[PDB]
Amino acid sequence: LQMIDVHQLKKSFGSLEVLKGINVHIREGEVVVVIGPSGSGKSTFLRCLNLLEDFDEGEIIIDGINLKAKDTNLNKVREEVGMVFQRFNLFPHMTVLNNITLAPMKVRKWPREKAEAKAMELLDKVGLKDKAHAYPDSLSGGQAQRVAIARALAMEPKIMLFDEPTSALDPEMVGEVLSVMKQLANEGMTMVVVTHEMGFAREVGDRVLFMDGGYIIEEGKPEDLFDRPQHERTKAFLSKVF
């Protein structure tokens, strides 16, 4: 039924409880956009979904695989979840092409040639096939972020997580990244995107999750939550940032 099933997820960092009982259902092929004030645990939530973070209480089931089960291979689960961070996504001492074939070649044992062809295909999809042999330090922010997306997709994941991938870029470079993300959404990839770009949220998001202080205060279709919020805290957040 769901590609991502989260039940009463709780997470603390010592004395500080960040996630206070998150409940989420995301269907395969759905694009879920997460918004909310800072410190609400948006990034922490993504990190949990990417297995970069252990969790205290709750249950997380990815593609029918409970992360707490005996027979669960967490590295295998980590193979089906791709993630793009706000900033440093590439190894600097590696070329674009090699950054992309590294995991597929190691993890999925693809021969160097099967990996590189797939990488050239993803580079073309993001419009940077000509940068295959360049190093990250020579890319613009917008180009590096697109390559970061190609790299994550090279593992052919079932889910793609995005933690404010454009929040850092200058306005000129924002579109080229969102454009790739939109293209990716039209392809049926299950996506979870933390972002402040409400235009992208409305246009390509299937559902929006309003996270505030460790809780999902409201949930709903973009149109319904942005223009018909049902909770004052939601209207509050939406008004102040407008």
Ligand X SMILES: Nc1ncnc2c1ncn2[C@@H]1O[C@H](COP(=O)(O)OP(=O)(O)S)[C@@H](O)[C@H]1O
Question: Which residue's entry shows tokens 């050239």?
Answer: 120
- Euclidean distance between CA atoms 13 and 56, whole angstroms: 10
Sign of CA dihedral 115, 78, 126, 91: negative
The minimum distance between CB 153 and a copy of itself, in angstroms, equals 19
The minimum distance between CB 95 and a copy of itself, in angstroms, equals 7
What is the token pair recorded at 44? 């922490």
Residues 187-226 that bind ligand X (CB under 6 A): 197, 199-200
Q: Which stretch binds ligand X (CB under 6 A): 25-33, 57-65, 132-140, 171-179?
A: 171-179
Q: How far is CA 5 from CA 59, 61, 161, in A?
A: 8, 5, 15
Q: Which stretch binds ligand X (CB under 6 A): 25-33, 65-73, 128-136, 173-181?
A: 173-181
Choose among ligand X, a copy of itself, none what residue 38 binds, the Cβ cut-off being 5 to 8 Å by kind: ligand X
Burial of 33 (0-12, 13-18, 19+ CB in 10 A): buried
Residues 97-126 that bind a copy of itself (CB under 8 A): none
Q: Which of 43, 50, 98, 99 is the binder for ligand X (CB under 6 A)? A: 43
Give the residue at shortest CB distance from ligand X: 43
* Contact residues for 88 (Cβ-Cβ < 8 A; gap 6+): none
The minimum distance between CB 74 and a copy of itself, in angstroms, equals 5
Q: How far is CA 208 from CA 53, 152, 173, 205, 217, in A?
A: 23, 23, 24, 7, 11
User: Is residue 240 involved in binding ligand X (CB under 6 A)?
Assistant: no
DSSP letter for 66, please. Answer: E
Q: Are 228 and 69 in contact (CB under 8 A)?
A: no
Q: How big is the site for a copy of itself, counted in residues (CB under 8 A)? A: 79
User: Is residue 20 involved in binding a copy of itself (CB under 8 A)?
Assistant: no
Q: Which of 112, 117, 228, 232 is the binder for a copy of itself (CB under 8 A)? A: 228
- Euclidean distance between CA atoms 70 and 25, whole angstroms: 23
Count Cα neighbours of 94 within 13 Å in the Cβ-side half-sphere: 15
Choose among ligand X, a copy of itself, none what residue 73 binds, the Cβ cut-off being 5 to 8 Å by kind: a copy of itself
The minimum distance between CB 110 and ligand X, in angstroms, equals 27
- Euclidean distance between CA atoms 16 and 97, whole angstroms: 41
Residues 137-196 that bind a copy of itself (CB under 8 A): 137-138, 140, 163, 170-172, 174-176, 178-179, 188
The minimum distance between CB 33 and ligand X, in angstroms, equals 12
Q: Which stretch binds ligand X (CB under 6 A): 12-20, 81-89, 101-109, 223-231?
A: 12-20
In the complex, the residues that contact ligand X under the rule CB under 6 A are: 13, 16, 18, 36, 38-44, 171, 174-175, 178, 197, 199-200
